[PDB]
Structures are given as structure tokens and as C-alpha cells.
Design a binder for this molecule. Structure first.
Ligand SMILES: O=c1ccn([C@@H]2O[C@H](COP(=O)(O)OP(=O)(O)O)[C@@H](O)[C@H]2O)c(=O)[nH]1
Ligand SMILES: O=c1ccn([C@@H]2O[C@H](COP(=O)(O)OP(=O)(O)O)[C@@H](O)[C@H]2O)c(=O)[nH]1
Ligand SMILES: [Mn+2]
Ligand SMILES: [Mn+2]
Lengths: 761, 761
């Protein structure tokens, strides 16, 4: 008991015994929050932040703070009058005030046609509150183009989010090259453009709109570059956006760019940096709704950040748009930059081959029928007459209506919604807008050089592609039900719909078909003595079954590991495992390719065999030679064929794995407010949990359907079909698909090379 | 051009019209002052605290409620703290100033006029004591001046009970408190002056003073509103008092103290010395135990410390049996009570509840008896376990809370082991340096809890349980050398621990390959008795020869498809929206079990029942009934054998798969502060991403190891072993394990029934 008494006696003995600018910014931020919550008395009090500090020795900061204080005091007077009621107005907000500060860097040595000092030397900036970008023009926001009276006929969007300065600099240099090429067209000839895109004035009619995604995620080097080109200012942003509470901040500057001894054409640029992170869909929402509804361009082009365009990409797009007068939208060719260089990388070469083949075959076939599912990230352009209303409304339905009402089906559909916009353009009511694919308007992008980055990219691509394909398949009746196309166009669309259904059905069972083809040809030619270049009649009879058993077990274990990994961890720490699986599949397909080549060469090459082989495999080379670019295929065929199983299995599995990856009161009044806030928090948590439950349930159901359909098809073919009664069917199906694609490419080539001469009729 | 001019003229015409305090205000200002003081900005903290104090002083007069008026006047304490902080800013030197602690007791709203008690004073009976606590690291809870009513009144508790509660209905808490009062009444009613009853601090008429029941909540945002209403009813929570007195303190949790009086029908329950520590921010049960153990135990310094979850009803003699064990043994470093499902006889139609009851009874009897024979128990999660605060004081608790003290990044994914760290506390108590503490299992101290009645709830619970059990088992296996390396046990104890370590290694190795062993056993016995004519009660010699292989093929395909679906679903979506799928798989496995069960019974009854067969069958299966009859409770097993047998494969496969599958500055200073905050946020995001990457990578690696080890073992047994060369081995292994468990149960029974008579020697 002595330790207890000692401790308690110890406790008993231990028992006895000028304002600031940051303050102004915080108070204005609180006032903005109070005004957001509609507490006008407190908002007026805290706003009256509004003059004593502007002690600053820096002339620019002193002027900015003086102007901000004066504007805030004027706004306080306006709000006080509003509360007094002598001025009646709906939803009061601080007045729109854009501040033009002299740019930090201006080049004394620069060459331009003609320009004014106010536009050239000074940079304009305005923070905007617009919650719904439709009433951007209603709240009084204007752009320098509108203020100066320039009426841009074409606008371009460059969505940018966490990129280095090099990509943006390359994109802007390429755009300047495009503008220079548009300037240098010879007048008074048949081929060149005429009208608003002539020389010496083309730079005024094109506006390049850079939409960021989040002030918290853009690269500091990116911001340093933007300040260097004279389009960003942290001090100006912080001073002039203190109490406005802007959702996005837009800076306007017709920036001048110089490269070596050649000074690029000035580019009319608007850069909308948005405060809260959102999706590329939200960036397009801001861009399209606000800026398009304001200046109303004739053509609207969209490209990602890092896509380098040739000198004639914009020229070819505009030429197509003017000469056709029917195209409701078009997209340029997507190409990997420097394909010849760095040929040692297999992933880069495989991506190059995939892009070239996809473009040529699929895009030519789809452009023949006037409906093209644009590749994600491709440099696509539309005309703002086929997109004005219902197409854009459908495009942004996901943002306008919360994901709970739509469901998971619509959300996964709108993951890559550029295809949805394309379909809505094609099937717009009471209008016949077809689509087009421009071969010569090549837009060079920079694809990932690692298998893990390729895996993530192809996951998002395949998710969007699959569900947009489902949308088109289910809603294809709208083309005949609502649109007014020609009867020939309706029949062509019906034929393409039949082809699309067959192609999508084949691609759904692609893993099962690939497994069956490899198994049958290679391993049941080896086991059952069907490889014409070798006699395995007797052998040991242990290796004969050992080959099939090893192949089956390796394939099944690889598929199980792939499913587990794709369902689980992010494919960035599994680089070694994914490289191992990809290398195993690649080596297996090189073995299969040599086995198939041996079989084809040892076969006495009957007429049916040679026709099928041509029409199945050599269709790639035939279409490439027709289009004039065959060296790319010649170089990248082996690299891509080494990556066919990785592509099919890994990418399809991972894409299907993550379908759910989607973005003066008293004390009684105080207690009631606390209870209401707690209840709203609980309801929001429950609603988010229900959203996640529905999304994950749909993901798992669709994944189970896909995987078990493939497994059941493979088992029923293996157990109930021989190589002689299935492989002819597979060859017929693949030959039919490649025949349709070859006919499409032939039609696209003949259309391009013939429509010029037959333009009179 | 006409509509363009029309719209631009419309915009031009639209161009006209470029260059008395409040209590809520007082609470908000005090909260801001608390935040500023947390940020160590003493000038701003002093200003805001002064404003809040004066605001409360002015507001309190206008309140009509006498309680709120007096309480707000008293709180407007804040002015005294303001004076202290102003003096601190140097005539008073003090390190880390904070508002002085102040506990305020308001009369309880409801006091029972008709109530019977031994003797009590009005101050403790009618008044409820409350104090908010800042203490961040609960070790210096006593250093900051915080005291409990037991310490203030001089009552010196010797047993302290913890009831962790989080999002629970009033009924569970009321049942737990009623059962605790029943235990206190039973401790009162012990006959003095006899051999059996306890002597000393737990005698009659005063035992209620020596026991403190500490209720620790987990979050004020998650506790049930009905739970809070019940707490007000028993007079232990006051929302107004909390909201006012916790304004500027910024307490991490709020503790209320009340010797609550409970009445049930015409019988008045014993008063319970209760402390209710409600945590402001949500945390884990580990953090709840951190607060409980460190703060309260280090303060009052108990003799025994008991831990129970909420909803666990104890019989009248649970505490008596635990304290009898602790007093009479004088060596037990910790004990755990029996875990039992309430009302097992009732609702026998539910299969999941019955299976859980059978699992609890068999696990308790067999495993806990065997472990208590050897003095080392892996405590079941949620069980009513108790320790003595002499074997837990230092290193065991430090190891227990290592996860909280050191962030999971340094520890790794293996250590994050501490999901269920009660086993870790058990092992650290057993292997504490320089002292020999063993554990014990109290059969008669039954703690009845309430299990989930749905397969999905069972799945989640068993995921938690299996996760903790597996990694605590790995810890014990890897660190079992510490018992001989550091502890001072008897040589016989060291040898017993070595024998138990060998048994534990074998048992864990067998349980790791449990799915593969179950699949092989079912496959071999049932389907390779049916296909190969080994079922002694039927002759399948000729048959159709198509159904003979069809049975094996159907079983294999169904098992593999079910396993794949289970992996995908478990590892993917949350098992709450897949109730139908999980019930389907469970029903399939239960029907398969039924088939296997009757097939095995037929095989045994048709076999001529040789001596080896009967011995193996008895010792393998009837070991359950033998141990149950020895312990006197055999009716439970007799009624629940079939119910648990139907759920063996669901248990093993589903639960194991889910558990393993989810492992005064200027603007330059302001800009520098913004940049520092951005960089800190980015580094925190990167650190969280790295944590998740390592965590998921370890999860997937262990899952792949487990699944592929099971698959490879199953394939190598199927292809390279016959039923005659593997099933004898499986029978021998399981027979050995059940022999060890039966011997353990027999030893525990004989120890309990013999140690009393042989206590002299
Ligand atoms: O959350 C995001 C991620 C990306 N982006 C942008 O939207 C386009 C997405 O293409 P990305 O470059 O991510 O795909 P890639 O070209 O790398 O395959 C690019 O302009 C991105 O900067 C966006 O707006 N929000
Ligand atoms: O985040 C949590 C979840 C639970 N608990 C409590 O800690 C114990 C965890 O046991 P649980 O109820 O999860 O297990 P069960 O009884 O449901 O099988 C119970 O007292 C819970 O109320 C907690 O402190 N924090
Ligand atoms: Mn890109
Ligand atoms: Mn519970």
C-alpha cells in the first residue's frame, strides 16, 4: 500500500497551483463565403476588408491594393443600398472588373503586320463567378475579342492539366506554324481558301482557348512558362480574386512568340485557370458553353495538350469544312511523334502500329459512311451549327444531372463522351449532319513509353469506347426515327449498323477467340501432328500432351493473376509483374507467329488458302500501300504482333475491372442548425455510399458477364468442336471483317482522289 | 452576316449598365480562437478569445433560460484565460499555454425520488460532472491537471471496465449496463467467512465503489441519436453543456462522469461508477483503447483492467469468476471470458446464427482449453477479456499502441498485424521481459454477445476476425523465440511452450492450405468414390460411363467457377449489394456439403467398421462430441452439427478469400506561405499514395501466394496422387490435430476439477 500512498500524496502535492494584408485577404475570403451562404449583414460587415495597407513600397502592389480597396468599397455601398431597398436587384454580386496590367516581358525586337500598344503590351484578366457557364454572357463577362470588336470565326481549345512547359510550348509553336501557313496562301486560285481565312489577317479570326483543370495541380514550371509568355500573374490573381470567390480565372493576352530568328504569328489566347479540380468534361463544359455561346464561332476545334499539328492540319480541316458544307464534325489523324527514332522500344512501336492501322482501316471505313467514333485525345473539330443545342446538352447531361438519376450505365458511357457528341451530331433531329475523317491533317501526340502508362491509358480508352459503342448500338434507331437523311444515307447507315454489331460482337469474345486460335493452330498442330513442316507422329507421347498442358496452365494462371491484379492494386507498383506477364504472352505469340508462318509456307498454298491469308493478314499492307504509307507497318508489324495478347487480355481485363472509377439566432436555433448540418452530412455520406454500391455492382455484374461468357465460349468450343470444324468459321469471320474494312479504306481513298474531278456532278 | 450583326448589336445594347452580438457569433469566434491557438498565433488568439468572452458575457443576460444564462455567464472563465494569456505574452513564464481546465456539474434533469441505495451524498447522486480534455498524447492526461471524480472524492478503484461503443442502439448499451449492475449485485451478495467467496476489496456493501465502468465513444458524428437520448435519460450527456463549455478549449474528446442509478421494473439496480469519454473525431477501437488504457489507467492505477465491447451481456458470475481466477492464481497476466451467442435455442431456423453458435462453442472449448493448458491464449476479437495492470503497464501496452505512436509508413504493411492487436497484447503479456505472465481461460465467465444474422454481416465480421488472426499468428510464429530469449519462465513452462509452438506451426500450416485440402477431400471421397466405384453402398461398375465422368466434371467446373466468382466479387465490390450472389454460392456449397455428408455417412456405415477406421472416425469427428460431453454442454453440438456442416465450405472459402483479398507579413510572405502550403499538401498526397501503393502491393502479393499455393497443391495432388495414397495422409494429419485438441480439452477439464483439491501441494 506504500506505493499507492506515495503516488496519491504526489498527486496531492501536485494539485495546488496597423492592419495586415493577410488579415485583409482572410476577411475578404470570409466575406465571400458569407455572401455565398446569403448572410448579407455579415457579408457587408466583412467586406467593409476594403485601403490602409496600400505602406507597400512596390508600385504595382500599391496600385493593385488601392484599386481593390476602392472597388470593394464601391461594392459595399452597392450592397448597403441593396439592403436598404432603394436599389432592387436579384442575387447581388460584386461588380465585374477586369484589370489590365503592363506585361513583365515585352520584346523590343519583334515583327508584326500592325498592332496597337494597348493590346500588344498589356495583359487583361478577370475572375468570373459563373456557376452555370450558360449565363456567362448574361452576368456581364466579356472577352477582349468582343470588346475590341474582333469576331473570331474559329476557336480552339487546349485542355491542360499537370503538364510540363515543353508540351504546351510545342503545341503553341505548332499552332503558330498553322497560322503562318494559313497566312501564306496564294490568292486568286482554285485550290486555296477564300474569305475570312485569307492572308495578312488570319491571326485575328482564330482564338486559342487554354482551359486548365485546377489551380492546385498545374505544374509550377508550367506557371513559370505562362508568366514568361505574359499570360499569368500570381499577385494579380490573389489581389483581384480576394472576395469575388471566382470558380475560374481567365487571362487574355494575344501572346507574341519568337523561335530563334523567326518571330511567330501572334495568337489570340484566352487562358481559363479554374480553381477547383474537375474533369475534362467540365473543362469542355466551361469552354463550349461560356465562350462558344458568347462569341459564337463558325467552327469549333478541340485538342488536348501536347498534340503537335503539321503546317497544314488546320488548313486541311477548314478546307474540308468549306468544300463539303455538310460535315457536322471532323477529327484529324493521330500519330506518335518520332516513330522512326527510338525503334528499340516495343511499346512505342506497337502503339504506332495500332494508331496507323486504326486510323487507316477503321476511320476510313467510318468516314465512308459518314459516322466516325473519334479516338479519345484526337484533334477533333466541329462546326457550331450542328452542336449548338441538343448535341451539347446530351454531351453535358452528366454534369447537368447528377449521376444518381442517370445510373452507372450512363456514367461509364460518358467517361469518354466525345463519341456521344459525335453520335448526337450524326443523329440530330431535323438535320442531316454527317462526320468526316481528314487523312492529311495529322496531329502528332506523345504516347506513354511504359507498359504501365499504356495500361492506364488503354483502360480509359476501352471503357469509353465500349460504353459509347453500346450507346450507339442501342440508340441507332434515332437516325431513322428523328433525323432527315437521304434514303441512300439511311441504307448506308443500316449496313454500317449491321457491320458494327458484328464487329462489336466479335470484339467482345476477342480473348476467347484469341485463346482458341492459338490453342488450336499451334498446340493442336503440335500435339495432333498438323504442323506441315514437322512430323510429330510418334514422339515420346509425354511431350505431345505436355505442350497442351503447359499452354493451358500458363494461360489460365496468367489470366487469373491478371484478373486479381486488375481488380486490385493500381498498375504502377506491379510494373515487374505486368512486364513478366506481357513478356510471357509476347514470347508465346512470337512462337505462334513462327509456327503459323511455317504452316502457311509448308502448305501447298491452295487458292482458298492464299485468298484467305491475303484477305485476313495482308489487308493491313494492302491498305497501307494504297494510302501510300506502308513503311510504318513494315517496321512495326512484328512489334505489334508481339503485343497482341497483352493488348487484348491485359487491356480488356483492366478496363472492365474498374467500371466504377468515376468522379441573430438563440441557442435553440444554434442547436437546430447543428442538427440539420449533421443530418445533411449523414444523408450525403449515405448517398455517396449508395452511388458507390450501384457503380461497383454494375462493374462486377458486367465484368462477370464478360469473363464468364468468354470462359463458357472457350470451354464449349474446346470440348465440343475440333480444329477442322471451328477454325474455318473463325477464318471466315475474320476475313469478312477485314474485307469490310478493306472495302471501306478503298472507298475512302477513291472518294478523296475522285470527288475533286466529279465535283460538278 | 445579318444574324451575326443582330447578335453583336444585341450585346452592344446590353453593354450599358474596364480600367447586439449573437451566441452563434460568439461560438464561431471562440472556435476560430481555438484554431489560432492551435496554430500558435497568440496575438490573434488573444484578440478572438477576448471578443468571444465579451460576446458571451453580453449575450448571457438576454437568455431567458436560467440554466443557459448561468452557464454562459460562467463560460464568459474565458476572460480569466484571456488575462492569463495576456500576462503570458512575460510577467508569467509558462511553456505551451492553454486554457485552464474547468469541470462544471449541472443537476441532472431526471432524478428518481423513489430509489434505494446503501448510502450516497447529494452532490454525487444528483449532480453530473463534465470536463473537456485537450490531452493529445493520453500519457500526460494526469500531467495537465485532469482529474476524475474517483480521484477527487478519494475513491480508489481496483477494477476498471471499458465499454467501447460506436454507432449502436440504446438497447445494446442498456443490456450491457444492466448486466454489469447484475454482476455488482452478485458481488455484493457473497457470503462472508467462507472458503469460496472473495475476501478484501470486493466484499459486500461496498463493491460498487471499487469498480469503475468507462464508456469510450468513437465519434460524436457517428453515435446514434437514440443512443444520445438514452445517455441523457440515464443522466450522463448534455448537448447544451458540451456545446458551450467545449467552445474555445478545442477538446479532442469530452468525458462525462456520473454514478448513474439504474432501475429495472420494481428492482433498483446497483449504482455504477461511470466515466463516458466521447471522442470528437472518429478513430479506431485501437485509439479508443489508447485513450482508455493510457489516460485513465495511468491515472487511477487499477489492479485489474477489463475490456469488453458494447452489447456483450455477462451472466451474474462473470466478474466473480474472473476475479476468483485472478486472486487464486496470482500468476495470470490476463484472461478472456467465454463468448456465446444470446438465445441460441431460440430462432433455430436461422442457419447462420446456428453456425456461428457452433463455431463459438467449438472454438472456445477445443482451442481455448488447449491454449489455457499451456498458458498462452489468442484472444477472440470482441471477447470479454481482462488483464491485471502489472503485466501490461509498460512494454506490452507500448507494443500494443506502436501503430498509433509510429505512423504506418515506417512500420510497413505487415505491422498494419495490428488490425486485431488483442492477440498482440496477449503475446506481449506472455513474453514480457524478466517476468513470467501466463494467460487463462475462464469457462464459467460466459459473455453473451449478439452475432449478425445475415451472411453478408457474417462475411464482414469474419473478414476482420481472420485478418487479425492470421497476422497475429504470423507474429507469434516469428517472435516465439522471445519467450526463451527474454522472459524468465520455468523450464517446464519453456518446454510446454516449445511443444505448443510446434503444434501451432503445424496447425497454421494446415489451415493455410485449408481450401485446397477441403476441395481435395470432397473431390476424392465423394466424386472419386462415385466415378471409380468406391461408395460401398452402391455398385457403379458399368453405369452409362457418361455420368461417371460427368459427376467429376460438373463438380470441378462448379467449384472452379464459384471460386473465380468469389475472388472477383470479394476482392471487388462490397459484399452488401451482392447478397443474392453470396446467398446463391452459400446455398450451392451447402447443398454440396449435404451430398458429401450423406455420402460419407453411407461410406462409413457400409464399411465393415474395422478397428483403425472406427478409431480414426471417433478421434477425428466425434472429438467435438467427446469434448462437449466432457465439458457438460453437448446439446448445443447435438443440435448444431448439421447447421455448421452446411456452412464449412462457405466459411473456409468465402471468408478466407475476403479476408486475404482486403489486406504581420507582407505579400512576399503571403505568397511564400501559399507556396509552402501547396508543397506540404502535395507531399502529403504523395505520401498517402505511397502508403496505399505499398499496402495494396503487399495485399496482392500475399493473396497471390495463398491462392497459387492452394491451386498448385491441389493440382499436384490431383495429378500425382490417388485417393489411396493421399486420403490416409489427410486422415492422419487431421487425426493428429484433433488428438492434440482433445488432449488439451481433457487437460483443461482435469486442471479445473483437480487444482482445488491439490491446492496445498
Ligand atoms: O483529370 C484530368 C486529366 C486530364 N485532363 C486533360 O484532358 C486530356 C486527357 O488526355 P491525357 O493527356 O490525360 O491522355 P493521353 O493523351 O495522355 O493519352 C488532356 O488534355 C489532359 O491534360 C483533364 O482535363 N482532366
Ligand atoms: O470504427 C469502429 C468500429 C467499431 N468500434 C467498436 O469497437 C468494437 C468493434 O467490434 P465490432 O462491433 O466491429 O465487432 P462485432 O461485435 O460487430 O463482431 C465494438 O465495440 C464497436 O462498437 C470502434 O470503436 N470503432
Ligand atoms: Mn496527352
Ligand atoms: Mn458487437
Amino acid at each position: 500500500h506504500a506505493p499507492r500512498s506515495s503516488m496519491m500524496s504526489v498527486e496531492y502535492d501536485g494539485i495546488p497551483l496597423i492592419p495586415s494584408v493577410e488579415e485583409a485577404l482572410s476577411t475578404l475570403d470570409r466575406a465571400a463565403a458569407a455572401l455565398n451562404a446569403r448572410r448579407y449583414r455579415d457579408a457587408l460587415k466583412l467586406y467593409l476588408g476594403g485601403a490602409n495597407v496600400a505602406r507597400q513600397a512596390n508600385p504595382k502592389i500599391c496600385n493593385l491594393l488601392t484599386s481593390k480597396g476602392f472597388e470593394t468599397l464601391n461594392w459595399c455601398a452597392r450592397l448597403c443600398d441593396w439592403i436598404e431597398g432603394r436599389i432592387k436587384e436579384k442575387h447581388p454580386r460584386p461588380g465585374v472588373h477586369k484589370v489590365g496590367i503592363p506585361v513583365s516581358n515585352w520584346d523590343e525586337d519583334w515583327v508584326g503586320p500592325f498592332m496597337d500598344e494597348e493590346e500588344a503590351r498589356r495583359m487583361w484578366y478577370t475572375p468570373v463567378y459563373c456557376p452555370h457557364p450558360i449565363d456567362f454572357s448574361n452576368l456581364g463577362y466579356r472577352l477582349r475579342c468582343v470588346e475590341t470588336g474582333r469576331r473570331p470565326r474559329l476557336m480552339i481549345c487546349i485542355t491542360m492539366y499537370n503538364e510540363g512547359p515543353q508540351q504546351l510550348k510545342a503545341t503553341l509553336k505548332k499552332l503558330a506554324n498553322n497560322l503562318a501557313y494559313l497566312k501564306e496562301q496564294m490568292p486568286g486560285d482554285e485550290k486555296s481558301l477564300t474569305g475570312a481565312f485569307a492572308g495578312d489577317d488570319v491571326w485575328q479570326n482564330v482564338l486559342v482557348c487554354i482551359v486548365a483543370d485546377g489551380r492546385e495541380q498545374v505544374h509550377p514550371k508550367t506557371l513559370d512558362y505562362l508568366e514568361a509568355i505574359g499570360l499569368y500573374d500570381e499577385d494579380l490573381l490573389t489581389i483581384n480574386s480576394a472576395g469575388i470567390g471566382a470558380q475560374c480565372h481567365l487571362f487574355e493576352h494575344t501572346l507574341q512568340l519568337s523561335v530563334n530568328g523567326k518571330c511567330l504569328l501572334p495568337i489570340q489566347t484566352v487562358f481559363a485557370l479554374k480553381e477547383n479540380k474537375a474533369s475534362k468534361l467540365d473543362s469542355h463544359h466551361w469552354y463550349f458553353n461560356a465562350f462558344a455561346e458568347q462569341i459564337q464561332p463558325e467552327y469549333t476545334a478541340v485538342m488536348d495538350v501536347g498534340t503537335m499539328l503539321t503546317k497544314s492540319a488546320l488548313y486541311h480541316l477548314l478546307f474540308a469544312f468549306e468544300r463539303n458544307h455538310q460535315i457536322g464534325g471532323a477529327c484529324g489523324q493521330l500519330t506518335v511523334d518520332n516513330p522512326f527514332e527510338n525503334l528499340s522500344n516495343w511499346v512505342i512501336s506497337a502503339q504506332h502500329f495500332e494508331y496507323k492501322i486504326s486510323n487507316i482501316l477503321d476511320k476510313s471505313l467510318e468516314s465512308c459512311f459518314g459516322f466516325i467514333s473519334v479516338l479519345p485525345g484526337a484533334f477533333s473539330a466541329y462546326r457550331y451549327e450542328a452542336i449548338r443545342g441538343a448535341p451539347l446538352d446530351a454531351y453535358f447531361q452528366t454534369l447537368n444531372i447528377e449521376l444518381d438519376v442517370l445510373g452507372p450505365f450512363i456514367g461509364n458511357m460518358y467517361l469518354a463522351e466525345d463519341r456521344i457528341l459525335s453520335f448526337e451530331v450524326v443523329a440530330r433531329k431535323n438535320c442531316n449532319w454527317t462526320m468526316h475523317y481528314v487523312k492529311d491533317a495529322v496531329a502528332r501526340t506523345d504516347v506513354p513509353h511504359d507498359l504501365v502508362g499504356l495500361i492506364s491509358q488503354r483502360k480509359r480508352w476501352l471503357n469509353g469506347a465500349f460504353f459509347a459503342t453500346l450507346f450507339s448500338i442501342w440508340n441507332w434507331g434515332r437516325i431513322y426515327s428523328e433525323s432527315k437523311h437521304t434514303f441512300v444515307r439511311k441504307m448506308a447507315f443500316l449496313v454500317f449498323y449491321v457491320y458494327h454489331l458484328l464487329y462489336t460482337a466479335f470484339g467482345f469474345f476477342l480473348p476467347a477467340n484469341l485463346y482458341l486460335a492459338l490453342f488450336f493452330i499451334v498446340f493442336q498442330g503440335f500435339q495432333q501432328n498438323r504442323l506441315e513442316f514437322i512430323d510429330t507422329s510418334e514422339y515420346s507421347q509425354t511431350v505431345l500432351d505436355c505442350a497442351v498442358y503447359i499452354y493451358n496452365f500458363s494461360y489460365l494462371f496468367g489470366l487469373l493473376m491478371l484478373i486479381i491484379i486488375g481488380l486490385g492494386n493500381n498498375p504502377k507498383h506491379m510494373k515487374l509483374t505486368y512486364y513478366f506477364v506481357g513478356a510471357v504472352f509476347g514470347l508465346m505469340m512470337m512462337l505462334s507467329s513462327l509456327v503459323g508462318a511455317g504452316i502457311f509456307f509448308s502448305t501447298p498454298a491452295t487458292v482458298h488458302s492464299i485468298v484467305v491469308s491475303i484477305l485476313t493478314v495482308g489487308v493491313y499492307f494492302i491498305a497501307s500501300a494504297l494510302h501510300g504509307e506502308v513503311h510504318h507497318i513494315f517496321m512495326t508489324f512484328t512489334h505489334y504482333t508481339a503485343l497482341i495478347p497483352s493488348f487484348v487480355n491485359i487491356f480488356t481485363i483492366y478496363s472492365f475491372c474498374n467500371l466504377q472509377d468515376l468522379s441573430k439566432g438563440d441557442f435553440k436555433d444554434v442547436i437546430a442548425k447543428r442538427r440539420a448540418l449533421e443530418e445533411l452530412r449523414r444523408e450525403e455520406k449515405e448517398r455517396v455510399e449508395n452511388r458507390k454500391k450501384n457503380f461497383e455492382a454494375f462493374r462486377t455484374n458486367v465484368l462477370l458477364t464478360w469473363a464468364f461468357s468468354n470462359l463458357i465460349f472457350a470451354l464449349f468450343v474446346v470440348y465440343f468442336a475440333s480444329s477442322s470444324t471451328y477454325m474455318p468459321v473463325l477464318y471466315i469471320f475474320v476475313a469478312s471483317l477485314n474485307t469490310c474494312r478493306l472495302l471501306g479504306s478503298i472507298g475512302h481513298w477513291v472518294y478523296i482522289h475522285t470527288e475533286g474531278l466529279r465535283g460538278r456532278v
